[PDB]
Amino acid sequence: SHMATLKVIGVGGGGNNAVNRMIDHGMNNVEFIAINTDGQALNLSKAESKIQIGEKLTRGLGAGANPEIGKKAAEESREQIEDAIQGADMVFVTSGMGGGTGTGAAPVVAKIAKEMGALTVGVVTRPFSFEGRKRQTQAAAGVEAMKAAVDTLIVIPNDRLLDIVDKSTPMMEAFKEADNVLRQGVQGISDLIAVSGEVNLDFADVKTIMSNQGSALMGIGVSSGENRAVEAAKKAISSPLLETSIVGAQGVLMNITGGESLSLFEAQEAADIVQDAADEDVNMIFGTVINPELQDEIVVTVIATGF
Ligand SMILES: Nc1nc2c(ncn2[C@@H]2O[C@H](COP(=O)(O)CP(=O)(O)O)[C@@H](O)[C@H]2O)c(=O)[nH]1
Ligand SMILES: [K+]
C-alpha cells in the first residue's frame, strides 16, 4: 500500500537527453517516458514508453524552436499522454526550456499529470546566455506556464554550469551534473517511499511538503567522519546549479539515514543547519532511517518548499 508509482517524463530534446542519461546510470522502480515531436530523437530513446506528438503538424520533425508547435502538438495528443501516465502517483516532468517542444509541450504534460491526481514536479533548465534573448524570453514563458501546471518546480539555469566547469570539462560531463539534480531527487524520494524508517516518513509526507507549493529545492548530501551530519546537511542544501536556493524555505522534509551510531545530537545539528540556512522559522517533517549496513556514513535528504 506504500509503494507509490513514480514516472519520469522527458519532453523535447533536452528532456529526452536527461531520460536517456538517467536510464544509462541505472534507475529501477521508476518508469521512464520520452515525449517528442522529433521522431528521430524518439527512435534513439532508451525509454520503455515513447510518445511521438504532433506528427500531423511537424511531419515527424522537431518543433524548430517554436513553442506554439509544442503546445499544439501536446494538446492534440492528450489521450496518448494520459495513457502513458495512467497509474502514476508521482510524475517528474523534465525539459529544456527555450525551444519549441519542451517550452510548449512540457506545461501541457504537467497539467495532464496534475489533473490525473499525480504529485507533479517539474525540473527544467533555462538556456545559456550565449543562446541569446529570444531563447531566454521563450524559456521564461515556458517557466511561468510550468509553474502554473505543477505542484513544485525546480529551475536549473544552464549558465550555472559555467560556474562548475574548468576550461576543459566536456560538455557531456557538465550536462551529467545538471542531470544529478533530478536523478538524486527521484532516488531520495524512491528510497523514502520504500525504506521503513525509525521515524518513518512516507509518500503522504512527500505530498504534504510538495503539493501546490511552487518553487522547490531537492537535495541529498553524504558525509563521513567528524562533523558528518553538518557536512551532509550542508551538501544537501548547497547546489550551485539552482535558481531556488534554500534561503526563504518555510517548509522542509529532512530525512537522515545512518548506521546504528546515528546520534540524537547530530540529528539536531543537521536540522539546525537547514533551519539557519533557510533564515526562516522552518516547519520540518523530520525522518530517520537506521541502515545497519552503514558504518560511518550519514545521508541527509532535503525537500524544501514554502518560498
Ligand atoms: N542542461 C541541458 N540543457 C539542454 C540539453 N539539451 C538542450 N538543452 C537546453 O535546452 C534548450 C532547448 O533545447 P531542446 O533540444 O530541448 C529544444 P526542443 O524542446 O524543441 O526539442 C536549449 O536551448 C538548451 O538551453 C541537455 O542535454 N542538458
Ligand atoms: K518509509
Residue numbers in the entry: 9 to 315
How does the study describe this entry?
FtsZ is an assembling GTPase that plays a key role during bacterial cell division. This widely conserved protein polymerizes in the presence of GTP and metal cations into polar filaments that gather at the center of dividing cells to form a dynamic Z-ring. First, GTP hydrolysis only occurs within the filament, as the complete catalytic site is formed at the interface between adjacent FtsZ monomers. We report a dozen filament structures of the FtsZ core (residues 12 to 316) from the pathogen S. aureus, hereafter SaFtsZ, in complex with various GTP mimetics and metal ions.
We also sought to solve the structure of SaFtsZ complexed to GMPCPP, as it induces filament formation with Mg2+. However, the resulting structure only showed density for GMPCP, which binds SaFtsZ as GDP does, likely due to GMPCPP hydrolysis.
